[PDB]
Assembly symmetry: D2
Homo-oligomer: 257 residues x 4
């Protein structure tokens, strides 16, 4: 079928990409980086993220495969030829992970996150009111906030004390970054896990400029009126050719491998 | 309909229970603590837990209401007469929360938890292997482990650094109690959120005696071979007469009220 | 004696400053903001920090007093006239708190911190090697690091999970900011408390530009070769007119007041 | 000089102890387990703790050496003969670490801790008032409290989120065990580091029976009126024959070795 391969850019990944394309030339596989049905990422998780955002507008028409040269990449380089044959056969199972939708309104722009989306200030102190489903939950003071996807809970979310979360759970998790808690300032302190259809809105208090990140992209937004977080209706689809449970790759990435 | 009322036992709750029974006598309400269709709890969360476990074998035939004299109790004492009329009218919406199933096998006994279930040792050091869906995830060394329900995430789970979790998410959360992490001993460190159909099994390493708790009940189990945690097929049903969102009562219980 | 008063700049603090100067005019007190022996700060902790850094080169010749209009400010506005008389009498006890010395070398500039000093990157990822007394302790990957004074442990340090620390202990505390811990990346995770004469050196790995903060001042340093942290030989002296223990003001600021 | 050797009891440590005694027989070394001037511990940290408590009443007359068969034990088994010669020469430097004093009053018994001392309840809920230097600081509700020595900060204290602490700092650290924090219950949350001459007193609220631990010893105390924690006037003396900094053995025990 139609496919393309992205590369980390280093010498090891470029030649591995060339060898796979040559192997695909022995099958009925058409290279097409405009409308690929399979997107193969050769590199680290950052390479996989760049591949996801490159084709973030054809998610319901693409299955992703990562090659580790790696949390999202679940294929070793020595298994590259076996992946070529299995991918050429065309018999695989489709696994879908939830995504996070971020909406920024001024006085709007929407983004899509596979890992997480964070909010910080433009230099000054970070103060926002957290509104959950039109209900004011807290006034947050600290460094920032992090809204994570299920697969992203093992990333930035994990470093902030968040809980690890199985991707079969369509939900999002919010965690704090060095929150201020005293006699007057008070936040929940604990990570919050929100289901679908729940909308978390961050509203400015004084400063209206925020440094907002979506995965590896970070932009300084000015004159912000609202940042809306909610579980996206879009999902990322993975092409899986063998059993690799989520808790097993969590074990291999943090326990031992 | 059929109903019963349990009381904290103090003077304030006993007379409040008597006044509600007298008010129910003015309607077509039959008191029956054997097969009640409505179980009213008058007291704290501990009183509500005792009421839940008293009728834990007729959950699919009971709706619970708590009166705060209180996380589960969402009614003030001054609103008691209004609750009598609304309950007498019989028009309310049913809200269901997930529960936790605990299975203990020797060389079996099953329990049901509304808050959480924890495992500790019988005095010696606590060492168990954590097996997730027949896959060995880690070997835990520390004080103990806590498997929490969604509504219980704000209880013992919250004190252990766990994430707060909306009850619409049918799942369970596991957290650590003073885990040992060094060059040789290593655990995930982070809370784990497990969906339905996922089974978490704790298996002994040396000592086989464990102090196991289910909500307020704590028993010393001897010659233990396996402790199995999984989201229960049973659910607790609440009788709700007005909108009281989960994040609002989280706000009222921890932020301000 | 010689003295000066700094103000938060708002209407409440400016007129309070004018009333105290008029009260000092009834005594043998000479106003001198060039060589003051007493520096009175009227405002919040930020106002107190600005006053400290304004006279950070005459610390061994100045005693500080804060008026809360407030962790460092231990005087209420209604007690202003009583403070004028006691300060005019000249009989008070001197209390000294340790300070933090920060040295930045390029390819040097030194700073003095009353609260803490933090290091972040200039946009890219933050990776430094932590060298304790010429011994490589760890390679840190995350958001940043925070080296705090004893009195600053209740500030930014507290939000990062650090321990609260009595100012009689001449030492400094280092805490992590969202550290990365997996199979390959590994840090100590725990706050580190260093005594006097211990030198903690942060050395760059790839990027050499860092956003370094000292209390409220934050500057982007370029071509950095080493950031050295150590307990300063300089100490800040407070003028205390009544018993106000450190744990009592910790209680009043976080427990209840 | 006078000396004795304790053993872990296993086959590896017993024969190693026999070989060292035979090597000591070639020098002017008298074995005496009643009044030894050098106490050699062969085993783990638990073996070292048992050796410390065995001679806890002659600390100012004993230097300790640990052999790892190990945080306190800073000698490898293959270096045993070199230790025999150096110990026989008698030229070594003395390193002293602070200790923790625990006093329990009823309606008194004192203990000495090298690692830490913890308080839990006898089954019921744990509620105590924390009084720092005759000043009520907080009312603690949770699982328990842990008062640690500087060298013990890397032990139980580290698992509870406490800060690591250099032993040159004569002080003690208190940490919480699953503290309850809501709208009504509120604790400091953060670890507390207390200098010398500071007394921390835990006073009962309802239940007066507590399970108190001192290192590996744990006893159920009944009718308790006060538990007093303070830095002990006694210190443990180590016999050091080579440079092994505290942060280096922290690195070797948690980072890599
Ligand atoms: N202070 C901090 N602590 C921790 N992470 C921080 C962080 N600040 C930022 N981030 C992460 O940086 C990413 C920016 N692009 C980096 C590419 C990536 C990635 C990634 N995804 C996952 C995942 N889904 N599950 C588990 N591990 C994952 N990783 C690994 O995290 C490490 C990051 O280099 C590498 O090992 C990665 O393989 C962002 O999306 C934030 O998630
Ligand atoms: N060390 C610790 N820290 C924190 N909790 C611990 C704890 N050790 C034990 N437990 C809890 O004790 C319960 C034993 N019966 C107590 C009755 C109860 C309850 C309860 N349920 C919830 C809930 N679902 N959401 C939010 N708050 C809740 N509460 C409040 O928690 C406080 C407990 O007294 C009271 O305010 C309760 O109202 C157990 O089930 C453990 O959950
Ligand atoms: N993410 C975060 N979380 C927590 N603190 C952060 C933070 N980021 C930055 N900072 C602090 O900001 C200060 C920058 N100038 C603010 C003026 C100040 C102050 C101050 N000193 C102390 C103290 N010594 N003990 C206890 N409370 C203190 N406070 C209070 O902390 C609150 C800060 O507004 C106010 O209540 C202050 O009264 C810096 O020095 C960082 O210490
Ligand atoms: N839940 C928990 N988490 C963590 N520690 C807990 C714990 N509950 C209890 N304890 C510790 O158990 C000790 C009871 N006797 C065990 C013998 C011992 C020891 C010891 N001392 C230190 C030290 N000074 N610095 C760094 N590591 C140390 N170790 C290591 O800690 C591990 C304990 O087996 C072993 O690796 C030991 O080598 C007690 O004193 C509590 O300190």
């Amino acid at each position: 079928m139609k496919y393309m391969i992205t590369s980390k850019g280093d010498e090891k990944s470029d030649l591995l990409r060339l060898n796979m394309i040559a192997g695909f030339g022995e099958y009925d596989m058409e290279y097409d980086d405009v409308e690929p049905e399979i997107v193969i990422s050769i590199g680290g998780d950052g390479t996989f993220l760049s591949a996801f955002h490159q084709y973030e507008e054809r998610l319901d028409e693409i299955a992703f495969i990562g090659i580790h040269t790696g949390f999202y990449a679940d294929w070793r380089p020595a298994e590259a030829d076996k992946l070529v044959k299995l991918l050429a056969k065309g018999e695989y199972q489709k696994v879908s992970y939830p995504l996070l939708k971020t909406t920024v309104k001024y006085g709007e722009a929407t983004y899509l996150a596979l890992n997480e989306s964070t909010v910080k200030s433009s230099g000054g102190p970070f103060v926002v009111d957290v509104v959950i489903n039109d209900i004011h939950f807290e006034r947050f003071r600290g460094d920032g906030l992090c809204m994570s996807t299920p697969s992203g809970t093992t990333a930035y979310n994990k470093s902030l004390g968040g809980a690890l979360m199985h991707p079969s759970i369509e939900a999002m998790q919010l965690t704090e970054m060095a929150s201020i808690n005293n006699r007057v300032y008070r936040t929940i302190g604990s990570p919050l896990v929100f289901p679908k259809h729940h909308v978390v809105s961050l509203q400015p208090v004084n400063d209206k400029d925020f440094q907002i990140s979506v995965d590896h992209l970070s932009i300084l937004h000015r004159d912000v009126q609202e940042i809306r977080y909610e579980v996206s209706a879009k999902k990322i689809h993975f092409a899986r050719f063998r059993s690799f449970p989520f808790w097993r790759r969590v074990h291999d990435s943090f326990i031992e491998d």
